[PDB]
Design a protein around this ligand. Structure first.
Ligand code: 5O0
Ligand code: SAM
Length: 256
């Protein structure tokens, strides 16, 4: 039994009150007040459509993934990653695909900086899509489940799906459940072939063990995974720590 599975058993035993006080204990988060207010009024400039823009921003500002040329965004949802990449000088095109329909977010049309190079397509299940030529591959897919064996199936399927889209290019791929032993085996094989490293984003809630496989970095995957399991287990041991609250991202306005 991995440390991650122990964390999961404990997470599953929490009452709703304890879960709500655990999920943001000691994390970092952006203040969405202004953007939620503006988005409700129908404003299409400056605002990120979701928390996702700031989440990808954290990786890019640390050079973990460096978007360039044709950017593919798998599971773009509302489009937070796509609108963030559209404003980057090395980016020439952004194509986002997302499922849509019941239970799934729809792309939000915006006019933030670089909107003219973005095309978000809904009604697109990525597990039925042929790979496309691209220079940057982004994937934020992985639905949480109380069952780590369900999450393990979901993680492996994403990892197997993205591989054909990785053609010596930049990448940032969400790994829903990186602690399950068969997931570790797949990641290690993928790291040998494609390089990169698994990283824990500070903006991720304690209610998920998600890590991101990024193209620019190196390291021991098992060791970084167990470090997160230990951190997440330690956050059950003390009274809620209020999160670090940061300014949300300003994505500007206008064409590129
Ligand atoms: N596209 C669409 C087309 C049609 Cl015909 C009908 C509905 C939609 N739209 C969605 O079903 N949106 C949607 C987007 C994200 C999640 C979910 S959800 O998981 O189903 O339900 C939640 C989850 C959490 C919360 C909350 O407040 O925390 C609220 C609702 C739905
Ligand atoms: C975490 S959200 C993406 C958040 C986004 N990166 C942002 O910044 O706004 C993951 C998205 O993947 C979508 N998704 C899940 N399964 C999918 C599939 N099979 N094909 C395409 N999109 C899928 C979900 O509907 C959801 O919107």
């Amino acid at each position: 039994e991995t440390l991650g599975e122990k964390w999961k058993k404990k997470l599953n035993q929490l009452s709703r009150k304890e879960f709500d006080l655990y999920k943001k204990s000691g994390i970092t988060e952006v203040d969405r007040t202004e953007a939620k207010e503006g988005l409700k009024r129908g404003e299409t400039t400056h605002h990120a459509v979701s928390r996702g823009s700031a989440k990808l921003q954290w990786f890019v500002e640390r050079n973990m993934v460096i978007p360039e040329g044709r950017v593919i965004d798998l599971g773009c949802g509302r489009g937070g990653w796509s609108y963030y990449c559209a404003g980057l000088k090395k980016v020439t095109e952004v194509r986002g695909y997302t499922k849509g329909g019941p239970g799934h977010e729809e792309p939000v049309p915006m006019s933030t900086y670089g909107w003219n190079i973005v095309k978000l397509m809904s009604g697109k299940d990525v597990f039925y899509l042929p790979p496309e030529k691209c220079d940057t591959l982004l994937c934020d897919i992985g639905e949480s489940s109380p069952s780590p064996t369900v999450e393990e199936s979901r993680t492996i399927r994403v990892l197997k799906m993205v591989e054909p889209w990785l053609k010596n290019n930049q990448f940032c791929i969400k790994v829903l459940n990186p602690y399950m032993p068969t997931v570790i085996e797949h990641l290690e094989r993928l790291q040998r072939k494609h390089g990169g490293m698994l990283v824990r984003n500070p903006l991720s809630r304690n209610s998920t063990h998600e890590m991101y496989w990024i193209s620019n970095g190196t390291g021991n995957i098992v060791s970084s995974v167990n470090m997160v399991s230990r951190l997440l287990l330690n956050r059950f041991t003390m009274t809620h720590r209020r999160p670090t609250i940061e300014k949300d991202v300003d994505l500007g306005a206008g064409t590129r």
